[PDB]
Write a protein that binds this ligand. Sequence first.
Ligand SMILES: COc1ccc(S(=O)(=O)N(CC(C)C)C[C@@H](O)[C@H](Cc2ccccc2)NC(=O)O[C@H]2CC[C@@H]3C[C@H]4CO[C@@H](C)[C@@]42O3)cc1
Ligand SMILES: [Cl-]
Ligand SMILES: [Cl-]
Lengths: 99, 99
Amino acid sequence: PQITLWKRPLVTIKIGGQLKEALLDTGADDTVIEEMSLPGRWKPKMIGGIGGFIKVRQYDQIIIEIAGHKAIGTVLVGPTPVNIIGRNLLTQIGATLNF
Amino acid sequence: PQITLWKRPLVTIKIGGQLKEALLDTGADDTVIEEMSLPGRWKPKMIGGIGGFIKVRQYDQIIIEIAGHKAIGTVLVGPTPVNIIGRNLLTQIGATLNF
Ligand SMILES: COc1ccc(S(=O)(=O)N(CC(C)C)C[C@@H](O)[C@H](Cc2ccccc2)NC(=O)O[C@H]2CC[C@@H]3C[C@H]4CO[C@@H](C)[C@@]42O3)cc1
Ligand SMILES: [Cl-]
Ligand SMILES: [Cl-]
């Protein structure tokens, strides 16, 4: 699809058996999802943005369906106000910015 | 151009006669620039990101060249870690997300 930016680029994602809405975010290096339960080992990480830093749990090798496209990568879980699909997964679905 | 996302989508901007580097950020509603002096009166705004809220100064009808494309619009100035080009200006240069 071609997504215009008059509105937030929100899509439906499937992760950990749950459906969620998430923002396609070219400004995010990594993918950050609100507090949920995921299987496997995790390690703690601090990530920073506007306002400062939050502590997240880093899960590796997570499968996520983004607008019907399967992709795998690291997912950070923590108290983010919005679910964010970052560049580490946008590349896997072949997303580009065009102008 | 067509910009893939294996690297941060950084571009050169020209604002107030200075060259700066900025991130093309589909996850940002508005454009946020580091501390500088800009012309005119400003209004207050409170914006929230991943790590809380910051106070910024809102300047309207500012001329900004983004990767050679002229835009004229609202710029927020404050303690952001990186210069961010948000959707308010991405729409002016015709940017879309494609996959
Ligand atoms: C290592 O991995 C990562 C991954 C993600 C982040 S990040 O999340 O800190 N960040 C990074 C950039 C700010 C440099 C990604 C960036 O796209 C971020 C995502 C977002 C959107 C909503 C809520 C929370 C986060 N946008 C945003 O802060 O926008 C703000 C600021 C501009 C206007 C004013 C606000 C109104 O509400 C939001 C939409 C805002 O739009 C950092 C590190
Ligand atoms: Cl990854
Ligand atoms: Cl590619």
